[PDB]
Structure formats: C-alpha cells, structure tokens
Amino acid sequence: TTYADFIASGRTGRRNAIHD
Amino acid sequence: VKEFLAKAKEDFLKKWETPSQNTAQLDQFDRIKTLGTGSFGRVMLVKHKESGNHYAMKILDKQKVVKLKQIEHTLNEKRILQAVNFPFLVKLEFSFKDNSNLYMVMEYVAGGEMFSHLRRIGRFSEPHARFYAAQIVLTFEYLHSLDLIYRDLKPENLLIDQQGYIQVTDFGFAKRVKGRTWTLCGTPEYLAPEIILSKGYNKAVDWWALGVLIYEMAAGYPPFFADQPIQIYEKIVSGKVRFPSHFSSDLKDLLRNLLQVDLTKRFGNLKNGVNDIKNHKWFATTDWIAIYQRKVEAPFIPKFKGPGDTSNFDDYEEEEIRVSINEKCGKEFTEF
Ligand SMILES: Nc1ncnc2c1ncn2[C@@H]1O[C@H](COP(=O)(O)OP(=O)(O)OP(=O)(O)O)[C@@H](O)[C@H]1O
Numbered sequence: 001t002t003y004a005d006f007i008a009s010g011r012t013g014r015r016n017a018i019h020d
Numbered sequence: 021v022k023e024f025l026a027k028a029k030e031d032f033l034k035k036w037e038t039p040s041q042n043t044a045q046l047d048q049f050d051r052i053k054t055l056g057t058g059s060f061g062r063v064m065l066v067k068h069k070e071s072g073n074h075y076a077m078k079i080l081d082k083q084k085v086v087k088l089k090q091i092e093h094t095l096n097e098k099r100i101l102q103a104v105n106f107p108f109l110v111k112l113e114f115s116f117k118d119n120s121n122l123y124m125v126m127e128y129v130a131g132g133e134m135f136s137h138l139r140r141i142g143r144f145s146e147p148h149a150r151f152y153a154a155q156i157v158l159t160f161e162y163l164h165s166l167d168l169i170y171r172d173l174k175p176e177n178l179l180i181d182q183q184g185y186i187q188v189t190d191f192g193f194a195k196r197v198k199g200r201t202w203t204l205c206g207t208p209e210y211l212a213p214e215i216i217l218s219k220g221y222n223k224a225v226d227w228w229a230l231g232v233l234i235y236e237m238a239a240g241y242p243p244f245f246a247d248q249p250i251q252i253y254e255k256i257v258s259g260k261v262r263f264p265s266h267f268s269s270d271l272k273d274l275l276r277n278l279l280q281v282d283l284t285k286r287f288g289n290l291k292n293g294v295n296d297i298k299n300h301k302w303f304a305t306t307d308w309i310a311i312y313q314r315k316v317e318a319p320f321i322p323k324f325k326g327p328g329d330t331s332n333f334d335d336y337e338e339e340e341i342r343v344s345i346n347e348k349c350g351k352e353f354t355e356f
C-alpha cells in the first residue's frame with residue numbers, strides 16, 4: 001500500500017528546510 | 021473583510037518602516053530545554069526572571085547563518101515577525117543579539133508541533149483537517165494582502181495552542197515582494213513545480229503548499245514522496261496525483277485545483293482569488309467569521325500540566341550556547 005511504502009521510506013521524520 | 025484588511029495594512033506598515041530592536045537581553049531569561057531544531061536554529065523553552073513567564077527562544081548562530089547564505093532571509097524573518105498581528109500567527113515578544121548569536125523570543129505554544137500529533141494518530145478526519153485548513157486560509161489571505169510570501173508551510177512549522185487552534189511559526193523564508201522572486205527554498209515535499217524549474221514565482225506557491233498540507237493532514241502521508249529530494253522533484257514536476265480511497269469527492273476536487281501545475285488555473289491565483297477557496301463545497305460548513313473569532317469548536321485540545329510543561333514535544337540533545345568575547349558579523353546584522 002502507499003502507506004506501507006511511506007512508512008518504510010527514509011522521510012517519515014521531521015523534515016528540515018533545504019540549505020545549499 | 022476589505023475593511024478589516026485596510027486597517028491591518030496601515031498597522032503593519034508603521035512597524036515594517038520603524039522596526040523595534042534590542043527589547044531584551046540574554047541574562048533576563050533562564051534557558052530550560054530545547055523544544056525543537058531546524059536547518060538554521062534551535063528553539064529553547066525559557067523563563068523570564070522578572071515576570072515569571074515562559075517563552076520560546078529561537079537562537080541563531082551568526083557564523084552559521086553566513087555560511088548557509090541566510091543573511092538576508094534572517095533579516096526578513098525578524099523584520100516581518102515584529103510587524104504582523106493575526107490570531108493564528110505566533111507573537112514575537114522580544115528580540116536581540118550578542119557577539120555570537122541572534123535571538124527571537126516568541127510566545128510559547130505548548131500544544132506541540134502539528135507534525136508530532138499527525139504522525140502519532142496517523143491522519144486527521146476531514147472536519148478535523150478542515151478546521152486547521154480554514155485557519156491557514158485566513159492567514160495567507162492576511163499575509164498576502166501585505167505583499168508577503170510565507171514559503172515554508174509544513175506541519176513542523178505549525179503549533180497547537182491551549183484552545184486547540186493553530187499558531188504559525190518559522191518565518192525563515194518569509195519575504196515582502198511585489199512581483200516575482202527566484203530563490204530555491206522551502207522543504208522538498210512542499211515545493212511547487214515553478215520553484216523546482218527555476219522559472220520565477222509568486223504567492224501562488226503558498227496555495228500549492230496548502231494543497232500539499234491538506235492532503236498530508238487527511239491522508240497521513242504527502243502526495244509526492246521518495247527517499248531522496250531529487251526523486252521527489254521528479255514526481256512533483258510530472259504532476260500525477262493519487263488520492264486515498266477515503267477522500268470525499270469534495271476534497272479531491274479542491275485538491276486538483278490547489279495541486280494544479282498550470283498557475284493560470286490554480287485556486288487562489290485566479291480572479292476571485294481567495295474566494296474560490298472559501299466558497300468551495302469542501303468548506304460549506306465553515307463559518308469564516310466564527311473561526312477568526314475563535315468561537316468555533318476545536319476538534320482536539322492538547323493536554324498540558326502546568327506552565328513550562330514540554331510533554332507535547334520530542335526531546336533533543338542539548339548543546340551549550342557559546343558567546344565569544346569578540347563580536348561576529350557586526351555590520352551584516354546591524355538592523356537586527
Ligand atoms: N513559539 C514556539 N513555541 C514552541 N515551539 C516552537 C516555537 N517556535 C518554534 N518552535 C519549535 O522549534 C522548531 C524549530 O523552529 P524554526 O522552525 O524556527 O527553526 P528553523 O531552523 O528555522 O527551521 P527549518 O529547518 O524548517 O528551516 C519548530 O519546528 C518547533 O518544534
């Protein structure tokens with residue numbers, strides 16, 4: 001499921017803004 | 021509303037033109053615990069000695085700000101935060117700097133980040149998500165009328181107060197602009213396609229971000245996700261969006277209008293502007309005046325045990341606040 005794929009992903013934690 | 025907005029703009033301009041500075045100092049507070057961190061600073065729960073009140077202090081290392089090229093952005097951050105006034109925006113209580121750091125002392129919003137609750141519970145029911153969304157909608161209306169672009173909407177930058185309402189924080193990328201701008205900034209999952217394509221953009225990126233927020237709140241996961249930002253961008257640019265089976269027809273319709281690549285069709289950026297969103301079927305049960313007045317029934321009210329309780333926040337490794345005997349980047353931050 002889409003859920004299972006998100007939960008197994010590496011971006012489920014707090015996401016910080018982009019910095020160069 | 022156009023009556024209210026006009027007065028608000030007069031109030032904002034006086035402050036934008038003559039910003040307040042140096043309204044406190046470091047030794048007037050007792051640093052207690054870090055509430056959260058980002059790419060740029062750290063926010064600690066602090067207590068003001070003379071009054072006994074708690075506040076949330078954002079600390080920016082001047083040398084780090086320079087290295088990451090956020091000098092102008094930080095000046096924007098403080099200059100704007102001290103001038104705005106709206107029921108759903110966090111208040112800047114005091115601000116100041118020293119040899120090493122820059123400080124923004126905000127009102128402490130004890131309910132925790134929306135992010136934490138959202139991931140714990142999994143997702144929000146439509147009426148629940150709608151309650152938060154209406155608030156964001158009225159906030160972008162206020163901000164946009166002042167010629168301001170927010171640029172960093174995400175659950176991590178949203179906090180729940182004692183009444184169960186939203187308080188927007190982190191004006192890091194907020195900028196006052198008439199026309200277009202080109203800075204590639206924000207958070208990968210929430211970037212609009214114009215940003216990624218380096219074509220120059222406007223306020224409409226905020227409305228695309230709202231579409232992303234509503235989707236994440238009601239689904240529990242974002243519309244475009246992957247392991248690396250580059251993969252994420254490919255998905256955003258393609259534009260293909262897939263909705264969970266529980267999404268109501270009304271919600272899906274609104275989202276196709278917000279997550280709209282064609283900026284000449286995206287809700288919020290049309291003739292009727294914000295009214296296309298307010299009058300949408302998904303928002304029919306919404307009493308726009310009642311919400312602004314905080315008279316509406318909050319779906320979830322965070323539990324808080326006394327002043328200074330940080331139970332609604334994650335724990336963070338503490339780091340000693342250093343202050344050199346030598347002033348750093350003095351000229352660069354003169355106006356701060
Ligand atoms: N007024 C407040 N009350 C309570 N907590 C707050 C407040 N303001 C910020 N925080 C907490 O501190 C965290 C980081 O603050 P902020 O978003 O300003 O940092 P940043 O480094 O600028 O973020 P980013 O990495 O997205 O650029 C927030 O995500 C939140 O958890």
Ligand SMILES: [Mg+2]
Nearest residue numbers: 058176177190
């Ligand atoms: Mg942040």
Ligand SMILES: [Mg+2]
Nearest residue numbers: 017058190192
């Ligand atoms: Mg930030």
